[PDB]
Every structure is written in C-alpha cells, then in structure tokens.
Design a binder for this molecule. Structure first.
Ligand code: MG
Ligand code: MG
Ligand code: MG
Ligand code: MG
Ligand code: MG
Ligand code: MG
Ligand code: MG
Ligand code: MG
Ligand code: MG
Ligand code: MG
Ligand code: MG
Ligand code: MG
Ligand code: MG
Ligand code: MG
Ligand code: MG
Ligand code: MG
Ligand code: MG
Ligand code: MG
Ligand code: MG
Ligand code: MG
Ligand code: MG
Ligand code: MG
Ligand code: MG
Ligand code: MG
Ligand code: MG
Ligand code: MG
Ligand code: MG
Ligand code: MG
Ligand code: MG
Ligand code: MG
Ligand code: MG
Ligand code: MG
Ligand code: MG
Ligand code: MG
Ligand code: MG
Ligand code: MG
Ligand code: MG
Ligand code: MG
Length: 115
RNA sequence: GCUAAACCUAGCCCCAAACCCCCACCUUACUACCACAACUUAGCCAAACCAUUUACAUAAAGUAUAGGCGAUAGAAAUUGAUGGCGCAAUAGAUAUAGUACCGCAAGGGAAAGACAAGCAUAAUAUAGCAAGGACUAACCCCUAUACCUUCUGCAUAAUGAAUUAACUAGAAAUAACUUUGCAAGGAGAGCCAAAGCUAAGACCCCCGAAACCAGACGAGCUACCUAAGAACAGCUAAAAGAGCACACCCGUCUAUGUAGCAAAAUAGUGGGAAGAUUUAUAGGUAGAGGCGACAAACCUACCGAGCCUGGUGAUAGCUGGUUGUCCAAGAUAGAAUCUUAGUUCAACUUUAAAUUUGCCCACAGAACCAAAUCCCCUUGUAAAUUUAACUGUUAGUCCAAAGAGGAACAGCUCUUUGGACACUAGGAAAAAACCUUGUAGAGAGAGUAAAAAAUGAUCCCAAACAUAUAACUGAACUCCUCACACCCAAUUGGACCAAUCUAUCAUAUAGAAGAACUAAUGUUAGUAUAAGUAACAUGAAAACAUUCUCCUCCGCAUAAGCCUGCGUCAGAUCUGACAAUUAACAGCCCAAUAUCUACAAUCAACCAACAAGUUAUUACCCUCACUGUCAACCCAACCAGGCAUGCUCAUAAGGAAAGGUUAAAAAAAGUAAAAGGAACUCGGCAAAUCUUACCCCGCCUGUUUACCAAAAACAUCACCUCUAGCAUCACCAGUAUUAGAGGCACCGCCUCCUUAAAUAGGCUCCACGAGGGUUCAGCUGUCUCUUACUUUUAACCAGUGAAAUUGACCUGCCCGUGAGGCGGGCAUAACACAGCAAGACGAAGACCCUAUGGAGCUUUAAUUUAUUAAUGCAAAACCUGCAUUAAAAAUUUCGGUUGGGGCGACCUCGGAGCAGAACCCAACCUCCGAGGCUAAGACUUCACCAGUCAAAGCGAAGAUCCAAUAACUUGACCAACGGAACAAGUUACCCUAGGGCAAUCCUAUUCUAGAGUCCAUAUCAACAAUAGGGUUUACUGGAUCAGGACAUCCCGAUGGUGCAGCCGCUAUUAAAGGUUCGUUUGUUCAACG
C-alpha cells in the first residue's frame, strides 16, 4: 500500500484456521439424496448400504486425501423418507436415526481411519 | 547510362536413438643424451533502505511447517510411472574461423559466396515548411507557423533524425465474459459441486548506468628494490651532493600545433650535468593489494582504486523508444506513505449485466451568535442505481468573481463557484485561456453569428478618405440537393486486414506465429553533404654515363628488436618465380674432494682519505660439431617522437628544405627602421642588452602532480620525543654511541622615502632559488604609430584526396507579437570566385536541485568479535572449548515542510475567522491545550484502518508482530504520533541517472507658503499630489570596431537675467561633428598629475 502498513498486516491474528488440516470433515448424505438414489435403482436397499455401495452408485464423492473421514446423515428430508435400509455411516443426527428406524431400519455409526 | 538490384545452397537449430573417441614436445613447449608436489559458493539481486532472511513425472500441495510470522521459503507419509505449422548468407552456430585482426596477457573477435538512395542523360530566373485551390498556362494569384518525444499549451522552448536497404521492442496466472459437451453431477484416478463442472478463446515490452562479489592476467610503461654492467668532453679548481659548459637527463617562459609530425610534439629561452646523477640487461613486489623524497602520485595511453571472464539479460520510482486500416465512449475532488520525479485506496473513465427510478424543480422546511446552498410533489426529460471485470488520469494553465498572504502592487503563494484549453471552426493583426460555434461526407447554392475607434535607443510604419440615403460582407452554426460509423490525450470496446507456415481445396474456409518501423545520439551495409574543399609530394641541367648547388649531433658497427621487408627475371602501376647470409667474430661450457682466498680502485708512486671496494690428490691420452651472419629494419595504427654502447667531431659517410606559376588579404617565422625609449601591459610577457639595490618565503644540492600547478609543498643534514635486553629468511649473520616509529628544520639569539602624480615597494642569521614583490641604469617595434623585404601559408594550373556537421529548404530587411519561415510594410532577374565574422541560441567544461542511485572519509552513528592480543575458567610442560576486556577492522544508513537553499522551528488530536446562510475547502495564514451484557437502525474526519449515537431486551443501581503469561489478557518504545526491531557528521577528489503600474523609496512638474537687505517666480523651494524608474539577502572588465537616443559636456541659434559687458546663471532649440594622455588598483569604481 505504498509503505502505509498493508491492510492484511494491520488486522490482528486469530485462529480462524489454526488446525484446519486436522479438523476432520464429513460429506453430508441427506435423506432426500438417499431416497433419490434408492428409487432410481442406484443403491440397493435389499443389501447392506456401506460406504462402498454409496460410492459405487455415485451417491457421494469421498476425498480421503482432503481429510474426509466419511458420510454423515443429515435430517433434511425426514418427511417423505420411506425405505427399509441397513445403512452404515460415520455419523448421524438423532433425527436421521429416527427417520431410519421409524420404517423398520437399522442404522449404525462406524469409524474409518484415513488409511 | 553507371552504381546497383535479384537468386540458392554451403551449412546450421531442436528432438529421438545410441554411452563417445615415422621424429619432436613440461628447459625458452614442439629441444636425442646425468645425482619440492593434490585432497562450506561470497555477492548482484527482493524486502520498494538494510542489518536475520531471499528460490537453483503426475497427485498429495503450494497443505503441514519455516519466516524482521514481512518479503518469501516449503516437505513427507501415500500414489503411479527417426523426425520438424525449424533458419536459408544482417537468419541459422561466432564460424568459409576461433582464422584475419586488436591486446604484453587473461582475453576479445570479424567479413563474405550466388535499375533503393547517389549521380548522368538535363545547372538556374522575383516569393519565402516548397503544398493545395486551381488555370488554357510550369511560375506568377489566394490559403498555408515542419515531424517525433517531454513540459499546462509550447512559433524550434528543449531532445532526436543526412538518406536508402535489411534487422530491431506485450512472454503468463487469479477471477470474470463468450461459445461448446455433460448436467445434481462434471473430469481419461488425485479436483471441484447449495447449477455446477470439463475444454477452448482473450490479457501483462525493448535499449542504457555508476556499481557489487568471485576467479584468472598483468611491474617489457611507470613507483620502488635487487644482481651484475655502462656513461659523464673542455675550461676553472683539487677529494667538493664545487662554478661555466658539451654528450645525457629534465621540461621554466613564450610562440607554433589543437583530427596536429605527435591521443602532449616542434623552435627558441631554460635547470642539472662526479652525483640523493643518468642509463642498457635479467628478477621481485599484484588490486583495498603493491609502490609512493604525500600529488590520492603511479601500477600498459581513460586509477578517490587496474584489466579480463563469470554471477549478468545485475538493478534502475530515472532518460529514450514501442511498428497495419477504420469507428466509438473518454480529463484535473481527496487520504496515507523515509512520501510529493513513485505507489495503494478512493473520485472520474470504459465494457458486459440486472433493476427502477435518476436529474431539473416551485410551496414547506434548516440558530441562537450578501451572492447563494441543501431538500423534495409536479413538469421537461431518459437516465440513474446495482452487480460482474479490468486498465488509465490525479496534486495543470488562463479568464470572471469572493477571500486569505505579499499594498489595496509587484503579473506574486493559496482556498472556493464558473468558463475555456489540452478537440472542431470563424473573429480581435499575429493569438491554447477573450467573443462566436460544436457530431464530422460531396456542392462552382442560400441566411446568419461574433467582428471597423473616439477626441528614448537598427527604420516612421498598411495606403487613403471630412457628407450619394444602410444596407451589404462574414464560419465546418443553420437551410438547401444527395450520402452518412467516417475530427480529443492517457485509457477502454468493436469491425476489418497486409505477408508467411500448416490442413483441405489444387486464391477460399480454418488453425498457427520470430506476424507489419516517417523516429531508441538504435545496429550492419550502400551512397551522399561539408568537397573536388583541408592536406600531401619531385634540389637544377643533361649526352641517363654525368656535372653542379646546398644540408646534417650525422654516419659505420655491435647489441636489442624484426624475420626476407627496393637482389635478378617475368607480369603490373604491386603479384609470381628464381636467388641468397659460408667462421677465425658471437653463442652453446666446465669431473670430484679439501685447501685456501686479511691490505682497494683511482697513470698507483708520493701525500691525503671514506662511502671500505684459486690451488694439492684422484679420473681422462678424445678433436671443431651445432647454431646467428640478408635489408632501406625496431617501439609508436602509417610518424619533426623513443631507442644502450664503440668509433669518425665535421665528416672519406649520409642526404634534398622549392610538383609549375603569381607575389592579394588575414595568419606564421625572420631581418631592417627615423625621433622618443616602458608612455604598452595585470606584469618589461616577447625582443635587445647587460648592470645594481633591497624585501617576503624556504637554510642549502635534490623530489613531485607521465598529459594545465616545480612552488612558499615533500626530502634534507642538526635537535627532540616514544618504544624495544635480543638469533639462523626482512630489521640482521645486526645488539642502547643499536634498531624501529614520530615532531621539527643546520648552526648563533630564548622556551617619512620612493613618482609629476603611489590602494603598490621600504628571533638577526652568510650561501643558494627557472620561488614571489619592488627599484636604478641600459636596451629594444612592447608602445606613441606603424612600414618594407624575405620564407611558409596563400590564390591559379596539374596529380592524389579526408573529417566533424546535415529534419527538409525554393535559406532577404524593418517594426510588432511571442523570428529567414507568424503579422503588417519594404525589397527582389539567375550564377560562380576570394574575404569577413554581426546572426544561424553556430558547432566541450562548469554551476544549482532530485534519486529511500553508487563509492567513500571521520567518528563519541547502529550492530558485531568472526580474526588477532591479553587475561580468566575447564581440557591432555602446549594446544583445544567457553567467557570478559581492548585494539584492529567488517556491514550498514543519512526522514519531511522551509529566509534566498542554510540557521531555527514544528511533525498526532482538539477549539475559534478565512469557509458571513446544508456539507467540504489550504496554509511556515490568523490566536490557545491534551497524551455491565446483548441488539433493530444509523452517522463519520471526503479511501481503508480506526471513530461515533442508539430504541427495544436481559441483569445491577498509537496499528501488526513479539516476548511474561494457565488465565482474566499485558506494557514501554513506536511523539519522524499509518509505526523500518536496532544506523550519525560529511564529500573543494567525488562517480552515474536525470531536471534547470513598489508598501519604504530615486528623480522632474503642480498651491505658492517659507525665505531671500523690499518682493515667490533671479534661486532653493519644505510636506504632499501627478508623473517615469528599483531595493536578493539577515532572522564582469580591456583591446578592436563601434550602431543608436537626447534627458546636451563642447561647438551652433534664441529668450530673461540681479551678466549694467566676455564669461556666469538658469530656459527653449540643436544629435551633422567631437568627446585626451598618465601614476596606484581591479565587484569592476575612486583618488591623484
Ligand atoms: Mg514509514
Ligand atoms: Mg534491496
Ligand atoms: Mg552469419
Ligand atoms: Mg556471425
Ligand atoms: Mg534511383
Ligand atoms: Mg529558426
Ligand atoms: Mg542533431
Ligand atoms: Mg622493470
Ligand atoms: Mg533494465
Ligand atoms: Mg521517486
Ligand atoms: Mg468521440
Ligand atoms: Mg423533490
Ligand atoms: Mg452541422
Ligand atoms: Mg487475400
Ligand atoms: Mg517483429
Ligand atoms: Mg533509425
Ligand atoms: Mg568552403
Ligand atoms: Mg592548400
Ligand atoms: Mg655458420
Ligand atoms: Mg668461435
Ligand atoms: Mg653483417
Ligand atoms: Mg656523399
Ligand atoms: Mg622537396
Ligand atoms: Mg607548391
Ligand atoms: Mg626605432
Ligand atoms: Mg633546485
Ligand atoms: Mg626555484
Ligand atoms: Mg587542385
Ligand atoms: Mg524582431
Ligand atoms: Mg563564399
Ligand atoms: Mg524517495
Ligand atoms: Mg545509497
Ligand atoms: Mg479549524
Ligand atoms: Mg485536509
Ligand atoms: Mg471515512
Ligand atoms: Mg435499554
Ligand atoms: Mg515517518
Ligand atoms: Mg504521516
């Protein structure tokens, strides 16, 4: 800025990003999307839905190398979800647990290390 | 018509593949043959200084991490791995060649081979950016201030260009926009994804410093030193840095010369010339180093720090450049910044896109203490806001107005409202800034706008006109017939396109790219201009055998250097062949071991000194090989220069000062000069003559700034001060009467005259000085005052034949504007030749300012102790590690506004007038101080960063980075107060890039009013007023020639007088003519005869 102290140096530091490379990330899998994938025949609800079968149906795109650890079910679309699925994900809000149980479904949260 | 112009390939560039190749020679390299050794990149460069710091498959990932946490730097785990839209002789390699040539050396480093400019055929005719309108007609008429770049516009204010041809300067990401594919997914793994992804398309130049660091090359020049050599006539004087003076060395003063004979010479005049002298030969000292009788002197022509290669395409807020066509939008609020020669933000500009209000604006409304301004309903309009994406400009000039500063002036600094300029056109003379006028083309149509004067110094300046009806003239404005994108800088958008290559046709559609030159003191080649100019050369006659005239510190030889460089023949105006220089002279040397090796040389004897100057034994009975041998010569680019020694000392040797002519100027050298003899001049410089006296400085001889200073500077005997008790590489084969480092400079003594005239001259201390000043006498063309002759130059004829310079020129004078070129007058047929120097701001060197350029010097400016030296502590009598103290260095910097730059103040924030009435507006203008939590909406110091107010609701009544921190957070400095973490004084040695209508007053005319023995006018004439003219520092003369005005000093004419008269005094008129010589001195005057 011509010698005047630059704008990006007169504003104090704060840990907006400290640790960002190690804060784990999870790709959402909304119930809307799960229903949409089930209907069009991409995932198969007559077979346990793990991460492999979510990806082999191109339902979510997992990036291991960017510190994604897995999927998280999100409550969006709890209404209108009608499917009997045995889904294994890496997180779940209690509303998603409900949405999967109310229709006679089992949901289990597993863990997967980056390797 | 010459000169030229043209061509193809010889080769090369980038890839792929494949791992590539007889003799002599380290001594003086290219020479057959005898007794030591090799083993961290600093820094240019970024941080806009600089100091820590700064780069040398794909993906992960520009992530972790490092970092004045600034600039920037930056992993790993894991993943998986024969060809050419190339050049084609200024290109491609530098290449026909690392040759020629340059340099001592390291090293540098070429060229080329196959009807352009310039001229001729054919010189020109008043006048003028060389053209345009035209015209029957080339000129004549009217119009018309060259181009680029930089400053606000620039008449050329300044910079650049002789001219042609060739070569020569926009490379790329982050987003965005456009067009395709696919679309909740895209992508040929890694990435993105709340319509996004993938692909393509578009956008970021060239030349130039002083410098820095590293490694090489240089002491054949010069500075000094070493070894072993050489020179120094004659006279005077006898052991001396003695006197006069040759060879030799130096270089005082003047003149010539200034691209010269010479990148420092020539001629004369000069200093030394037995010594501290001069000099040939080999060796040594090497660049922050050497050497230095210190001058920043010299180290291979350019040294306040050599040269070459590399880092290097150094960097450059600075200068200069930046190449096809056409159209369109397009300009002067401000803030911060080691900042005002620049950058970033804003404001303004541009494009694409979205949306709906934008501008003008009455009535109402805005405070207590003149102009106008603000705000909106309508109305005339069609624009405005918002979003996405970039560049560019920024502290401009003039005019009207209101203010502040300098008078209410100085064409003066600053703020504000408006206009114009940097855009077109017409007017006021020329004219950026006044008045008139804009949207662009063709017309041999038309209507208008503005627009005319009244009553001191070269040469006045349109010519004229008192009285025939007021209208006409006049633009690119407007109308007319036709056609329309077709007149701004920086910038931005768009439509076209020259030429080349590739794909397909086989000029088009595409794709590419070394893709376009009126301009960089651009580079290379060609040819011009100055120019057939400056300059150069061959003694005479002849019968080519010879004779004559004149000249030389020259000639012959050796050495050094060079290497066939005027011998014959044959071809030309130099090329080839042939031939040569014969060793006795000179070089090329030596078997070993021990021994010795005290006393000079000077005609070497007298006196006298100091600087002190080979063999005995052992081994060998071998013979002349090898090389230089020439010349007109070497170092200076080819040369009035440089070059050691021996002998000839004016020549037995060697040469030629005049191409022919005439006898102009100016110039150069020389000779002569009447009377006077320094009156010249800064000065007796030069020349002629040869004498004297003093004063200042330095004791003397000597040395120094190669190439502007030879001195009053350096050195020097003598004296003094400081340090040092001693081995084999200097001091030193030395030892306190010695050695090194400093100051000073023997010795003795102490710690009013001058001239006619005058600003000049007048601690003791002999001798000396190209030192400085003064004087006597003489001398002389220095001068009063020039003149003649000779030589060179010169001018002409003949031969040979440059260079600076050059935008184009068809190249006048006077006045005005701001000048050969503009305006108004005047002049004007064309053309050589020789002169001159008034003008063409006619073609190196200085001075002021700037750069967060460079290099220094000093320090009590900041940082360091790495290296050394002392200690101190551990380590096994010496070295290693750590710490402290010092010296020695090393790296680094020099804030801002300013009287007239310096001195001195201030530098952030706040309040009052300028800024009278929303907002804002400068000051080194005017006057003063300070250092509870949550949350709708807003205001703001014209950016940002900061800053400010706040309904409701819930609870109680001076920045960033760093360190200490558990913390809740915390501070100093940053006051140069948007802040480098820590840096001053100075450059007379500096280098590069660049910029350059007077307050106070002087004088004359107006009231006379005051005086003058009476009386203003015979004189001063006070203040003031009206006139023409300047005052810059504190808090440029002289010679030479002079042109001009009159405001007249003289001469001329006239009036009054208190001159009763010449002369005086004032006043009018008059510029044809004239307006002296000297002493002292040089802000230039003044004084004096
Ligand atoms: Mg600063
Ligand atoms: Mg720097
Ligand atoms: Mg070539
Ligand atoms: Mg070449
Ligand atoms: Mg021609
Ligand atoms: Mg001119
Ligand atoms: Mg020029
Ligand atoms: Mg020598
Ligand atoms: Mg550059
Ligand atoms: Mg600057
Ligand atoms: Mg326009
Ligand atoms: Mg309104
Ligand atoms: Mg028009
Ligand atoms: Mg074509
Ligand atoms: Mg080009
Ligand atoms: Mg050129
Ligand atoms: Mg001439
Ligand atoms: Mg001549
Ligand atoms: Mg021989
Ligand atoms: Mg012999
Ligand atoms: Mg001989
Ligand atoms: Mg002879
Ligand atoms: Mg001759
Ligand atoms: Mg002649
Ligand atoms: Mg005489
Ligand atoms: Mg002397
Ligand atoms: Mg002397
Ligand atoms: Mg001639
Ligand atoms: Mg004039
Ligand atoms: Mg002439
Ligand atoms: Mg600066
Ligand atoms: Mg500097
Ligand atoms: Mg104020
Ligand atoms: Mg302000
Ligand atoms: Mg603000
Ligand atoms: Mg409240
Ligand atoms: Mg500052
Ligand atoms: Mg400031």
């Amino acid at each position: 800025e011509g010698g005047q102290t630059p704008f990006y140096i007169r504003i104090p530091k704060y840990g907006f990003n400290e640790g960002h490379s190690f804060r784990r990330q999870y790709k959402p899998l909304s119930l809307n999307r799960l229903q949409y994938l089930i209907d069009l025949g991409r995932v198969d609800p007559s077979q346990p839905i793990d991460l492999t079968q979510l990806v082999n149906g191109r339902g979510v795109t997992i990036q291991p190398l960017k510190r994604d650890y897995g999927v998280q079910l999100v409550e969006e679309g709890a209404d209108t979800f009608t499917a009997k699925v045995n889904i294994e994900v890496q997180l779940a809000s209690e509303l998603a647990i409900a949405a999967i149980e109310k229709n006679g479904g089992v949901v289990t949260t597993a863990f997967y290390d980056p390797r």
